[PDB]
Amino acid sequence: STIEEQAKTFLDKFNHEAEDLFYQSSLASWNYNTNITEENVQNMNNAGDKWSAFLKEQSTLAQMYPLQEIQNLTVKLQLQALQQNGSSVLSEDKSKRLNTILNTMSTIYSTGKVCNPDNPQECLLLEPGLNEIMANSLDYNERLWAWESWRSEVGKQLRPLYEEYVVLKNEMARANHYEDYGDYWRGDYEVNGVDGYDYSRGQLIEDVEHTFEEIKPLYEHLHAYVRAKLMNAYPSYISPIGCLPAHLLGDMWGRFWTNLYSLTVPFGQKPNIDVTDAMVDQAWDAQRIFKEAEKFFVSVGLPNMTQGFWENSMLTDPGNVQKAVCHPTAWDLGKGDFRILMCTKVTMDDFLTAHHEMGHIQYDMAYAAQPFLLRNGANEGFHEAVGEIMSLSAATPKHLKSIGLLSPDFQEDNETEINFLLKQALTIVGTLPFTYMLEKWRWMVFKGEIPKDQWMKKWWEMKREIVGVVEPVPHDETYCDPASLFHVSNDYSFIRYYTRTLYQFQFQEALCQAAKHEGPLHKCDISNSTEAGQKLFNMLRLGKSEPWTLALENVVGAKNMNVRPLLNYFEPLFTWLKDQNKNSFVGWSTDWSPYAD
Amino acid sequence: VFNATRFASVYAWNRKRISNCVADYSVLYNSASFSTFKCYGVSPTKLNDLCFTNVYADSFVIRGDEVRQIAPGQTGKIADYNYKLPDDFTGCVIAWNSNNLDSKVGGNYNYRYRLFRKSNLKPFERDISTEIYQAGSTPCNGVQGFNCYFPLQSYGFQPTNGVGYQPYRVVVLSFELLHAPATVCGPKKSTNLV
């Protein structure tokens, strides 16, 4: 009689009908990625539209069950996502024009290219063409030509398409009773209905801004060290208290500094840990690479992989006849069908990536018993965070020596680990400032605090203050830097990468306390320890059915994000960088520019 | 019985009456052709020495995770709304993976189930009624709509599905001893003569 019974009935029949259409929609995309054919391209659109229109048809009946009469927390969470109308709230024109802007901006990204200034005939596309050249390019002009010319025909041309994306997406948030479109993404962390665990959407701006203050002393030292090694190349453009060029970050957007690890090696007289030459002599293939990782999850207590998982895996690309995307991805369809599509070579990264790609599948097995709408991570940062903790355990010399990759007589000391922390710091400490910088800029533009003319004026003004990077060539409001980015042009969450760093480290410190490991954190290894797996398995099966604030307390015992695990794991590196920076100036100034003298 | 090409749906499950013959259960247990075999109230080795008056062999197909709901005094969707075992049920359960037969490319919707019912089914009760289920007080009149749903649902069957959800053909034998004379008995021996 009560609306509760009617709501639970609508939710029971929704999981069955949605599981069949969702599985066929994801299955169609699998055959399209594994094999490029005219039949798979159409099946992805038909199966994709059938499932896309399914939620639109169920959303009409979901708004007829108010959440005020529902006293069940698990029931409101399932209807919380269905209550949203998506693009239905937008006008007929604004709703159809939105997909045209997303498809137009996404097409220019893949079709965009920059012709070689020296070779006008040869014109290389950004990916891989422009992303690979900028990685190993040490030239100042060669890197500036592709970096400066890209945003000229892209950033400038995408400005009118980006303006519509800002006005169109805002109309959707306002129809949803949201302060703005920026608050739309913050809704993933929204927590309500539980006394004391409530997490407001606006509290994210204060947490990300409060936690970033503690990372400054660690990043300032890491930035001063990188500027000292590269200061001998161009002392005029690189000031001691200034900032590093934007195109010298090692790649197009300067997201990860790992490419600079070669020249930033503190000690070149000592060997480095690499499994490439060790795996070659062992004569291992893609079939035994995943098998070795499957035994790791069993040592911690996690169930093994189903027979269909290993049988349906795609270990390589059979030439151009049948082509697939080598980009590692973990595909979860449904009905217990788990698969991974990746191109498997013999490298030290593929071994670490195998644990990451398998972490997503292993993570999907815990909450697989939850309802369709309840199957998901507690937030957007837990997806890749659970997979990083698995890779961090494999990179430790203790895990490598266990399976026999690294020689048992390999000497492990400060000089050996100091070089390892620097490699992980560039990929970790390097993305944090860039993530908080770009993510915070989008929130200000969407909120309306930055006029359209100040988009670029505030972009570089906040860049030197956050990441300490200055533009070699000044740009006007015509250019759009985020327009060229992959996540910004594809309408994907860019904040999930910032929180992933804080979440992956919290679990690393908590899981190692259960296994009773002593010494530095980077020396910890969760293998052979079945006590840490039982504690992490509890939250793995919860998913988003419970507030992420509550599930996070059962693991690390914290009700919010904390930077403490970031300082301890990087503590040994901070102590060494502090001494090497005594002869230099720690930090940078925002009053220095390469074109302003 | 288990070799039959097609089996009835969980709601359509057929009930076969077996009587007036001899039963050899050693071939089914030692054949290793079953995925899971369990009995309730009677041991498998004692069946050969016991004579039963009536033996009912149930046939149907259910999900892998749904097999755990088959037992005396169980619960769940398939147990309450489809097939339930009384607390005194003395029979046995048999199941094996049908993914190599029932499941086919594109999916097989021929096997359905009853998702909703106004109450829980009684022991050994089969209701094929397709009448629309009314969640609330809003009239339905056989027309789908708000608070009106179709109870029967089709099991998704494809070979790419997980082993847990793979369809399993289950044969439930109901052993009931009534006041009528006993006929079905275990096998014989007939040793050598001297």
Side-chain angles (χ1 to χ4, degrees):
Chain A
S1 178
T2 59
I3 303 301
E4 182 178 2
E5 294 178 351
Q6 296 177 337
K8 183 178 179 180
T9 299
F10 176 81
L11 296 174
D12 290 344
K13 183 178 179 180
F14 177 81
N15 291 336
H16 180 62
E17 294 178 351
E19 183 178 2
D20 290 344
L21 296 175
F22 178 81
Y23 178 78
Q24 294 178 336
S25 178
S26 296
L27 177 63
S29 296
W30 178 256
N31 291 337
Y32 176 78
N33 291 336
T34 59
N35 291 283
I36 302 301
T37 59
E38 294 178 351
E39 294 178 351
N40 291 337
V41 62
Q42 294 178 336
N43 291 336
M44 176 178 71
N45 291 337
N46 291 336
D49 291 344
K50 294 176 179 177
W51 182 88
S52 296
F54 178 80
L55 278 65
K56 294 176 179 177
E57 294 178 351
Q58 296 300 321
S59 296
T60 299
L61 296 175
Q63 63 180 19
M64 293 178 71
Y65 296 140
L67 278 66
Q68 294 178 336
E69 296 302 322
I70 295 170
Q71 295 300 321
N72 187 340
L73 177 63
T74 59
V75 176
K76 291 189 295 184
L77 296 175
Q78 293 178 336
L79 296 175
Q80 185 64 59
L82 296 175
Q83 185 174 355
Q84 184 174 355
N85 291 337
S87 64
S88 296
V89 297
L90 296 175
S91 64
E92 183 178 2
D93 290 344
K94 294 176 179 177
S95 64
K96 294 176 179 177
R97 294 182 182 175
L98 177 63
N99 291 337
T100 299
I101 302 301
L102 296 175
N103 291 337
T104 299
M105 293 178 70
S106 178
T107 299
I108 295 170
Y109 176 78
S110 64
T111 59
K113 63 182 178 181
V114 175
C115 296
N116 187 340
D118 291 344
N119 186 340
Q121 295 300 321
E122 182 178 2
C123 299
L124 296 175
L125 278 65
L126 177 63
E127 294 178 351
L130 296 175
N131 190 30
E132 182 178 2
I133 302 301
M134 295 300 294
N136 291 283
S137 178
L138 296 175
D139 185 4
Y140 176 78
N141 291 336
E142 183 178 2
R143 294 178 65 85
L144 177 63
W145 294 356
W147 182 88
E148 183 65 12
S149 296
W150 177 257
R151 293 178 179 83
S152 295
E153 295 177 351
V154 176
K156 292 167 62 181
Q157 185 63 59
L158 296 175
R159 182 177 65 84
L161 296 175
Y162 176 78
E163 294 178 351
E164 296 302 322
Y165 175 78
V166 176
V167 176
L168 295 175
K169 301 303 287 185
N170 289 336
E171 295 302 322
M172 176 178 71
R174 294 182 182 175
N176 290 283
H177 300 290
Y178 296 141
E179 183 178 2
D180 61 9
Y181 177 77
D183 182 67
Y184 176 78
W185 292 96
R186 292 192 297 273
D188 181 67
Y189 297 140
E190 182 178 2
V191 176
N192 290 283
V194 176
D195 185 4
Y197 296 141
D198 290 344
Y199 177 79
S200 178
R201 292 192 298 273
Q203 185 64 59
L204 178 63
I205 295 170
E206 295 178 351
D207 291 344
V208 297
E209 182 178 2
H210 182 62
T211 59
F212 178 81
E213 294 178 351
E214 294 178 351
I215 297 170
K216 294 176 179 177
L218 177 62
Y219 177 78
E220 294 177 351
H221 294 82
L222 177 63
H223 182 62
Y225 176 78
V226 176
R227 183 180 64 257
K229 302 299 183 181
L230 296 175
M231 176 178 71
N232 291 337
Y234 296 138
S236 64
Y237 296 141
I238 295 171
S239 178
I241 61 172
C243 296
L244 296 175
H247 60 284
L248 295 176
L249 296 175
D251 59 353
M252 180 66 181
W253 291 272
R255 181 182 64 196
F256 59 89
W257 294 356
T258 299
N259 291 336
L260 278 65
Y261 176 78
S262 64
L263 296 175
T264 59
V265 175
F267 297 96
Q269 294 178 336
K270 302 299 183 181
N272 62 345
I273 295 170
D274 185 4
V275 297
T276 299
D277 290 344
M279 293 178 71
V280 176
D281 291 344
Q282 295 300 321
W284 294 357
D285 60 354
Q287 294 178 336
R288 291 191 297 273
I289 294 170
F290 296 160
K291 183 178 179 180
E292 295 302 322
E294 183 178 2
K295 294 176 179 177
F296 177 81
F297 296 160
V298 176
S299 63
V300 297
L302 296 175
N304 62 345
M305 297 296 180
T306 59
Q307 294 178 336
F309 177 81
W310 182 88
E311 183 178 2
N312 291 337
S313 63
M314 186 66 176
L315 296 176
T316 187
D317 185 4
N320 290 337
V321 176
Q322 295 178 336
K323 183 178 179 180
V325 176
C326 292
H327 186 279
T329 299
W331 292 95
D332 184 3
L333 279 66
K335 294 176 179 177
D337 185 4
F338 295 159
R339 294 182 182 175
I340 295 171
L341 177 63
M342 177 179 71
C343 298
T344 299
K345 294 176 179 177
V346 176
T347 58
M348 177 178 71
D349 291 344
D350 290 344
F351 177 81
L352 296 175
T353 299
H355 300 290
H356 181 61
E357 296 302 321
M358 293 178 70
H360 300 290
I361 303 301
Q362 184 64 59
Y363 176 78
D364 292 344
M365 293 177 70
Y367 64 90
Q370 295 300 321
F372 177 81
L373 295 175
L374 295 176
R375 294 181 182 175
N376 188 339
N379 61 33
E380 296 302 322
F382 294 160
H383 299 290
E384 184 178 2
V386 176
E388 295 302 322
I389 61 172
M390 297 298 100
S391 63
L392 296 175
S393 296
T396 59
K398 183 178 179 180
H399 182 62
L400 296 175
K401 294 177 179 177
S402 63
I403 60 173
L405 294 175
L406 178 62
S407 178
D409 290 344
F410 177 81
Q411 295 300 321
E412 183 178 2
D413 61 10
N414 291 337
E415 295 82 357
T416 59
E417 294 178 351
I418 293 170
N419 291 337
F420 177 81
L421 296 175
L422 177 63
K423 183 178 179 180
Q424 295 300 321
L426 296 175
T427 300
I428 295 170
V429 176
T431 299
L432 296 175
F434 178 81
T435 300
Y436 177 79
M437 176 179 71
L438 188 150
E439 183 64 12
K440 183 178 179 180
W441 182 88
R442 296 176 63 185
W443 294 356
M444 293 177 71
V445 176
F446 296 159
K447 183 178 179 180
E449 294 178 351
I450 295 170
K452 294 176 179 177
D453 290 344
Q454 294 179 337
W455 291 355
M456 295 297 100
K457 294 176 179 177
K458 302 299 183 181
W459 178 256
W460 291 96
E461 182 178 2
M462 293 177 70
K463 184 183 292 179
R464 292 192 297 274
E465 182 178 2
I466 295 170
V467 297
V469 176
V470 63
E471 70 284 5
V473 176
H475 298 165
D476 60 353
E477 70 283 5
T478 60
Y479 295 92
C480 183
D481 186 4
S484 64
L485 178 62
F486 178 82
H487 295 82
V488 175
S489 63
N490 296 131
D491 185 4
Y492 296 142
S493 178
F494 181 80
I495 188 65
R496 62 180 296 176
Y497 295 92
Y498 176 78
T499 59
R500 180 177 63 84
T501 299
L502 296 175
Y503 296 140
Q504 63 180 19
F505 295 160
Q506 294 178 336
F507 298 160
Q508 183 65 260
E509 183 178 2
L511 296 175
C512 294
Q513 294 178 336
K516 294 176 179 177
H517 298 291
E518 294 178 351
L521 178 62
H522 60 283
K523 294 176 179 178
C524 176
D525 185 4
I526 61 172
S527 178
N528 291 283
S529 296
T530 59
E531 294 178 351
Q534 294 178 336
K535 293 177 179 178
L536 177 63
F537 177 81
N538 291 337
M539 176 179 71
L540 297 175
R541 62 180 296 176
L542 296 175
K544 64 180 179 180
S545 64
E546 296 302 322
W548 58 273
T549 59
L550 187 150
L552 178 63
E553 183 178 2
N554 291 337
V555 176
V556 297
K559 294 176 179 177
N560 62 345
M561 294 183 286
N562 190 29
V563 179
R564 181 177 181 172
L566 177 63
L567 177 63
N568 291 337
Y569 179 78
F570 291 158
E571 183 178 2
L573 177 63
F574 177 81
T575 59
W576 182 88
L577 296 175
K578 183 178 179 180
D579 291 344
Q580 295 300 321
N581 291 283
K582 294 177 179 177
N583 291 283
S584 63
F585 177 81
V586 176
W588 60 92
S589 178
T590 59
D591 291 344
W592 178 256
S593 178
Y595 63 89
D597 290 344
Chain B
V1 176
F2 178 81
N3 194 343
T5 300
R6 298 295 181 190
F7 294 162
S9 296
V10 62
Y11 63 90
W13 60 273
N14 291 337
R15 181 182 64 196
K16 302 299 183 181
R17 181 177 64 84
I18 302 301
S19 178
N20 190 30
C21 56
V22 176
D24 184 4
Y25 297 140
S26 64
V27 176
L28 296 175
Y29 177 78
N30 291 337
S31 63
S33 64
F34 59 89
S35 296
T36 187
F37 177 81
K38 183 178 180 180
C39 293
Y40 296 139
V42 176
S43 63
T45 59
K46 183 178 179 180
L47 296 175
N48 292 283
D49 291 344
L50 296 175
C51 295
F52 295 159
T53 299
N54 291 283
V55 176
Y56 297 140
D58 185 4
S59 63
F60 59 89
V61 176
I62 60 172
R63 294 182 181 175
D65 60 353
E66 297 303 322
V67 176
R68 60 177 182 182
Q69 295 178 337
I70 302 301
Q74 294 300 321
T75 59
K77 179 179 75 180
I78 302 301
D80 290 344
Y81 296 140
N82 290 283
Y83 178 77
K84 182 179 179 180
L85 279 66
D87 291 344
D88 60 354
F89 178 79
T90 59
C92 299
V93 176
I94 296 171
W96 182 78
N97 188 341
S98 63
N99 189 30
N100 291 337
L101 296 175
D102 291 344
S103 64
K104 63 182 178 181
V105 176
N108 190 30
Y109 296 92
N110 290 337
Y111 297 141
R112 294 182 182 175
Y113 65 90
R114 184 182 296 275
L115 178 63
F116 295 158
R117 184 178 183 273
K118 294 176 180 177
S119 64
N120 291 336
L121 295 174
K122 294 177 179 177
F124 296 160
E125 183 178 2
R126 181 182 64 195
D127 185 4
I128 61 172
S129 64
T130 59
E131 182 178 2
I132 302 301
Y133 176 78
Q134 185 174 355
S137 64
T138 299
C140 296
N141 291 336
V143 176
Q144 294 178 336
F146 179 79
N147 289 338
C148 299
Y149 297 139
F150 180 78
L152 296 175
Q153 295 300 321
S154 296
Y155 294 96
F157 290 158
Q158 294 179 337
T160 59
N161 291 337
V163 176
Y165 296 140
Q166 293 177 336
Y168 296 143
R169 294 181 182 175
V170 176
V171 176
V172 176
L173 278 66
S174 178
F175 296 159
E176 295 178 351
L177 178 63
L178 296 175
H179 60 284
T183 59
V184 176
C185 298
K188 301 302 287 185
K189 301 302 287 185
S190 64
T191 59
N192 291 337
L193 177 63
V194 176

